[PDB]
C-alpha cells in the first residue's frame, strides 16, 4: 500500500514548521473531530494571573548563560545547554519546574533561557500506526534533550475532568499548590494529542513557566529522553493512573519487551 | 553628529530591530520605561478569553470572499491583497476591525491577519529638534500599510484619573471605559508625537479575543509616507485641552490647530 500524503499541515500554519499527515496503513481519513490550536484555550472563567508585576524576573545584561541569572536559579539552574537542549544531568524522572525568562526580564528575547517559548523546531509527522490509530513520528534525527512540542489543549478544572466521559486526551498537570488542573485536548488540542503511550518512551514531560507564573497552570513541555532516529515513533509514559482506568477497555500494543500494560502482562499479574 | 545609542529598543521582541539615534544633543537612550511588545496588566482585568465566545469564520480559501463572517463583522475586510487598507477606508471614523482568529477554520496566513502579524516596516527612534524623541520611517511606506500597535499598560478609567504623568495615556473610549498607559510600560508607539497634519491613524482591532472593552490600537498610514518622515497622529483635542496651557505645539504645519499663534487668533477673534 502506498503511503499517501493527506494533509500538508494539520497545524494550519500556526506552528513554526508544517506538520503533514500521511496514511499508508488503512483507509482512515485525516482526523478532524477536533480543533487544532497552537496554544492553550479556556472555556470557563480561569483568571490566569497575568499581572506583569507578579513576575519573578532576572536582571542579566548577557545572554543569561550565567549562574547568576535569577530565572535560572528559580529553576535550580538553567537546564539548557548552548544549543537549547536539556542537560543530560537533568533529573529526568524527578524534573523540577523550569521558569524561563519573560517579558519582565531585562534580557533579550533571544536569551539562552527561552527554549519552550520559541515553538516547534523539529519536522514532525502525524501518521497511521499499525495497532494504535494515529501517532506522531520524527522526520529527522533528534538529539537527546531536544524540545519536541507542547501538550496543548483546553484548560479545565480537576472537577471538570471528573465529569468528562472521554478521558483519552486528558493530561493531569497535578498542581502541588492548591487544586489540580488539567489539559483536555479532546475538542481543542495540538499535535501532542496524537502521541501514543510507550512502555519504552523516548520523550518526557516537563512543567514550564514562561509568560506567566500562575502555579495552577504550568505548561507541559516534551523533550527527547534519548537520541531519536528518523521515522521513529514519539511516545511518553502515560503513567499507571491512565492504565488502571483504561484496563477494562483496551490494552497496550506498544510491543516493548518491557511492556507493563499488555494483556499478557495483566493476565500474568493476576497470579 | 549622529550617533547610535541602541541597536534595538525592543530587545529582539519585534519582527525587526528598532534602533535609536541622536544627532541633536546629549540625551542618552531613554530607559525610564519598560519596553513591552504586547499590552500588559497590573491588576485583574477579567478579559473574556473564552474560546467558545469567539465569533469565527468557516472559509477554506484565503478569506477574500464576502462570506467571511470576520469580514462581515468589520463591514468588510478592508485589507487589500498586500495587507494594506483600501483607499476608500473611512479614515476619520474607522469601523471596528475583526481579524480572523484561532477559532477560524481558515489558515494563519489568510488575508485578514495584518495587525496580528506585527511590525514590518523599518522604523527608527530618533531625537527631534523640538519634541524630545520621535519615531521616523526608514523607508517609503505606501498608504494603508500597518505601522505598529499602541502598546502599554491597561488601566481603568478611575486609575487614569490618579495618574499624574498623563503624557502616554491613550483613550479606547466606550459602557465601560479603559485606557492604555504607555508611561511605565510601552512599545515604540509611546514615542510617536502629535502632528496637526497626521500621517497615521489609529484603528480599533480585535484578534485573539473579542472583549469589546479592550480593542487593540493599530496605526495605519493615512497617506504615502516618504523616507525619513516622522510618524504622527492627531492626539485629539482632549489631550491639548489639558496640555496646551503647559506646552504649545511644535509640528509647524501650515494648518496647525494648537500652535502658539493659532491660539491667539481664536483668543483675539473671540
Ligand atoms: C493523553 C494521555 C494522558 C496521559 C496521562 N493522563 C492521565 O493520567 C489522566 C486521564 C484521565 C483523567 C485524568 N484526571 C482526572 C480524572 C478524574 N478526576 C480528576 C482528574 C488524568 C498523564 O497525565 N501522564 C503523565 C505522565 C508523566 C508526568 O510527569 C510528571 C508526573 C510523574 N513524575 C515522573 C514526575 C513528572 N505527568 C503526567
Ligand atoms: C500621548 C498620546 C495621546 C493620545 C490621546 N490621548 C488623550 O487625549 C488623553 C490625555 C490625557 C488623559 C486622557 N485620559 C483620561 C483623563 C482623565 N481621566 C481618565 C482618562 C486622554 C488620544 O487618545 N487620541 C485619540 C484620537 C483619535 C482616536 O480615534 C477615535 C476616537 C475619537 N474620534 C475623534 C475618532 C475615533 N482615538 C484616540
Ligand atoms: N500504547 C498504546 N497501545 C494501544 N493504544 C494506544 C496506546 N497509546 C495510545 N493509544 C490509543 O490512543 C489513545 C491516546 C491518544 N491520546 C493518542 C491519539 C489517538 N491514538 C488517536 O489516534 O487519536 C488511547 O486512548 C488509545 O486508544
Ligand atoms: N506636537 C507636539 N508639540 C510639542 N510637543 C509634543 C508634540 N507631540 C508630542 N510632544 C511631546 O511628547 C509627549 C508625548 C509622547 N507620548 C511622545 C514622545 C515624547 N516626545 C518623548 O520624547 O518621550 C508630549 O507630552 C510632549 O512632551
Ligand atoms: Zn537572566
Ligand atoms: Zn529572566
Ligand atoms: Zn534571559
Ligand atoms: Zn506497552
Ligand atoms: Zn474567513
Ligand atoms: Zn475568520
Ligand atoms: Zn481567515
Ligand atoms: Zn500643530
UniProtKB/Swiss-Prot annotation, chain A:
Record: residues binding Zn(2+) 2: 58, 71, 101, 105
Post-SET domain span: 248-264
Coiled-coil region: none
Signal sequence range: none
Expressing tissues: Expressed in all tissues examined, with high levels in fetal liver, thymus, lymph node, spleen and peripheral blood leukocytes and lower level in bone marrow.
Binding site for Zn(2+) 3: 64, 101, 107, 111
Residues given in the record as Zn(2+) 1 binding sites: 58, 60, 64, 69
Marked site: Histone H3K9me binding: 151
UniProt family annotation: Belongs to the class V-like SAM-binding methyltransferase superfamily. Histone-lysine methyltransferase family. Suvar3-9 subfamily.
Function of the protein: Histone methyltransferase that specifically mono- and dimethylates 'Lys-9' of histone H3 (H3K9me1 and H3K9me2, respectively) in euchromatin. H3K9me represents a specific tag for epigenetic transcriptional repression by recruiting HP1 proteins to methylated histones. Also mediates monomethylation of 'Lys-56' of histone H3 (H3K56me1) in G1 phase, leading to promote interaction between histone H3 and PCNA and regulating DNA replication. Also weakly methylates 'Lys-27' of histone H3 (H3K27me).
Annotated protein name in UniProt: Histone-lysine N-methyltransferase EHMT2
UniProt organism field: Homo sapiens
